[model samples]
Target: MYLRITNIVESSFFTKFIIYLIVLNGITMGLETSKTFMQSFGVYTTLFNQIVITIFTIEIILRIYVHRISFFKDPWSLFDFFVVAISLVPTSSGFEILRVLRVLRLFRLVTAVPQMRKIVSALISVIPGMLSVIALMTLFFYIFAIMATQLFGERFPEWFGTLGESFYTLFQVMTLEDWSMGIVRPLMEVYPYAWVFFIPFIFVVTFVMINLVVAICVD
Candidate 1:
């Protein structure tokens, strides 16, 4: 119940080894990114992958011995243990040589690295509110698409003949592109009144959409 080194890992040397493995894994990730240039270091990628498995083997053994039954108490620790353990299992047939599995294995750092946990929690909490605002905007687009089709189907069968085309035009408008200019520019010479649709669509996306994201993040 009480936390003690003897209850987990009494050996300072084994504890130090775990720390070294964590640091080396981070270094390996950094070096792997620079592999286009680092290939001159003269080891084949396959051999480098083998070396990584070797390191993972030693680290996993020491950790299992240290924590024993309680190792699975922290799910992240168990996840770190299993990912390395599974990757190190000898393969008789082709699977993958790249050890790309290790990429997500590094997420174990979220447990070891406190700042990662804080940032991850913040982003997770904001996701729901952000999605809600996006959903609201999409609902408005659908309603507007139906209205456009009803109002302009007889007049402009080329573009607003169907809800689908109306939705496409609304998409272009939301992107702040010049669909109105393509169709309405010549019409404006005939009547001078296309800004009515152009201005409100710009205000909704530019002003409303922008403010919604800011508000969600702040909340």
Candidate 2:
């Protein structure tokens, strides 16, 4: 009986149907954003969401019944329950993030598409490389963290006063978010040569990060 259930659940037809169902669910959530779209389509929007919760509940149960305890360990298996469960939540304001996550649930198609397993395999294969890249990253952060604490500690006590604070602000700079206007320009106001230090720092860190991502894609 367990084997019979497995055969039904694992079949391509059912999986394909579920894939299309999730795609429709994701696409409909997109239109749910348009005030005009909602004006016309609210009835079908509820219709489809209800249908998804119903069918996804069945799909979740069938998979669980087939795989039993084995299903519990796999992340791919686990997300279906949580993602579908989100749809059941009650919210006011239509909770934009709720619709955001409704669209987010579309990623389940990655599990259905077998060829995309290469990305996961590559992610696993590159873990050791990622470890080394991070070690290099930490070493760089440490060197800069200490230097900035010494250099900028007195002038910009809030950002670079302590080693811990230096680390946080430097990470902010590395992300290139308002580094000039918010951080560097303010620093340059007092320490005119501060750009000499910051520009090189940004270059080196960004170059290292670019290669790190490149290596991941290559692997």
Note the Cα lDDT for every prediction shown: 0.68, 0.85
Task: Name model 1 segments beyond 4 Å from true.
Answer: 1-19, 33-39, 42-48, 51-102, 138-202
Cα distance off (Å), candidate 1, residue 45: 6.5
Count of backbone collisions within predicted model 1: 0
List model 1 lDDT by residue over 55-99, tens digit each.
767666656666778887866577777777666656544565535
**How would you encode candidate 2's per-residue C-alpha lDDT over 55-134 as one tens digit per residue?**
98888989899888998887777876787767656544667687456655677777656666568655677789788889
158: Cα error in model 2, Å: 10
The TM-scores of all predictions, comma-separated, are: 0.46, 0.73
- Predicted model with the maximum lDDT: 2
Model 2 score (lDDT): 0.85
Q: Give candidate 1's error at residue 17 in angstroms.
A: 4.8
Model 1: lDDT of residue 189: 62
In model 2, where do residues sit more than 4 Å from their true spots?
92-99, 138-172, 175-183, 210-219
